[PDB]
Write an enzyme that holds these catalytic residues in place. Structure first.
Site, mmCIF file in Angstrom:
data_model
loop_
_atom_site.group_PDB
_atom_site.id
_atom_site.type_symbol
_atom_site.label_atom_id
_atom_site.label_comp_id
_atom_site.label_asym_id
_atom_site.label_seq_id
_atom_site.Cartn_x
_atom_site.Cartn_y
_atom_site.Cartn_z
ATOM 1 N N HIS B 114 0.837 -1.189 0.000
ATOM 2 C CA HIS B 114 0.000 0.000 0.000
ATOM 3 C C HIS B 114 0.876 1.245 0.000
ATOM 4 C CE1 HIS B 114 -3.422 2.626 1.472
ATOM 5 N NE2 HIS B 114 -3.995 1.900 0.529
ATOM 6 N N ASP B 131 -4.572 9.076 3.067
ATOM 7 C CA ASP B 131 -4.804 7.676 2.728
ATOM 8 C C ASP B 131 -6.046 7.590 1.855
ATOM 9 O OD1 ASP B 131 -5.037 4.950 2.490
ATOM 10 O OD2 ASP B 131 -4.999 4.523 4.637
ATOM 11 N N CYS B 183 -3.555 3.003 -5.747
ATOM 12 C CA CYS B 183 -3.103 3.696 -4.545
ATOM 13 C C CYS B 183 -1.968 4.666 -4.851
ATOM 14 C CB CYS B 183 -2.667 2.685 -3.487
ATOM 15 S SG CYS B 183 -2.984 3.258 -1.818
#
Lengths: 78, 224
Positions: B114, B131, B183
């Protein structure tokens, strides 16, 4: 002239090297990956936080005697 | 925000199609982007460190322009090293950079599988965590604040001043991921608008266009 250095991996393993300066560190990089068996596109050779590319030399970099080159692996993420 | 993509689509498809990998394309900041690297922007592939760090350096190059905040971007290995090994392991990564002379510090954060972004804004006196999956990581900014305290000492011998230094994370105030691979795209696109001092306007629907646009932007080393 010539200086020695250590290439410490993330597992704490040392590989000692000597090099001239004003010579590309491409050959040192190639020799390290030839031992770990992994592709060089997998490993990043960074000194004091600075990415060592194949054209970088220990002269332009700050590297002096008994210096250390940290070795990191590729980061993927999704 | 807009911009078209012209005959670039042919150029984007030219490098997306198969060629020998490891063949270098685009070199700047003493960094190379191999054919394997740019392949991580195709389809819904996971972005790698070479693409992200190259993009951060391009934002760093744009920061020198008038009317924009000055930016210094740490490499994607910085936060992981600092959190796991302490400040003295990364204390010498900034011996040619005075982090207190810039306006914005870009800290790309790799979390195993991530990507995430932490930003230090000396103007707003903020340490924000971004995030795209909605995760809260206020410990990450507490780590960065302690880094700044240990960095003002050792580099300037001054006790860092910590008023209004807001350590916080974003919730549903930034566009969310909506899939499981975009991401690194959100992390880089977050920093693009932040370094432009512009509001975050994009959504998940812009990521397919962003991936192909970043391919051309990286090849030509020109931010759009």
């Amino acid at each position: 002239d010539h200086i020695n250095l250590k290439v410490a991996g993330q597992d704490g393993s040392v590989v000692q090297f000597k090099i001239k300066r004003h010579t590309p560190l491409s050959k040192l990089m190639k020799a390290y990956c030839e031992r770990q068996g992994l592709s060089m596109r997998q490993i990043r050779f960074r000194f004091d936080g600075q990415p060592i590319n194949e054209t970088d030399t220990p002269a332009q970099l700050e590297m002096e005697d008994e210096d250390t080159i940290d070795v990191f692996q590729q980061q993927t993420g999704g | 925000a807009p911009e078209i993509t012209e005959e670039m689509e042919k150029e984007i498809k030219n490098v997306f199609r198969n060629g020998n990998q490891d063949e270098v394309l685009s070199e700047a900041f003493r960094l190379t982007i191999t054919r394997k690297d740019i392949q991580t922007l195709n389809h819904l592939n996971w972005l790698n460190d070479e693409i992200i760090n190259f993009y951060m350096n391009m934002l760093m190059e744009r920061s020198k322009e008038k009317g924009l905040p000055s930016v210094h971007a740490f490499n994607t290995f910085f936060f992981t090293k600092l959190k796991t090994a302490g400040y003295q392991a990364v204390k010498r990564w900034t011996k040619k950079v005075d982090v207190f002379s810039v306006d914005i510090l870009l800290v790309p954060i790799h979390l195993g599988v991530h990507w995430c972004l932490a930003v230090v804004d000396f103007r707003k006196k903020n340490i924000t965590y971004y995030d795209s999956m909605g995760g809260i990581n206020n410990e990450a900014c507490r780590i960065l604040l302690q880094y700044l305290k240990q960095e003002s000492i050792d580099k300037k011998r001054k006790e860092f001043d910590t008023n209004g230094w807001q350590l916080f994370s974003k919730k549903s105030q930034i566009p969310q991921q909506m899939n499981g691979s975009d991401c690194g795209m959100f992390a880089c696109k977050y920093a693009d608008c932040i370094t432009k001092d512009r509001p975050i306007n994009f959504t998940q629907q812009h990521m397919p266009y962003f991936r192909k646009r970043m391919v051309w932007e990286i090849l030509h080393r020109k931010l759009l």
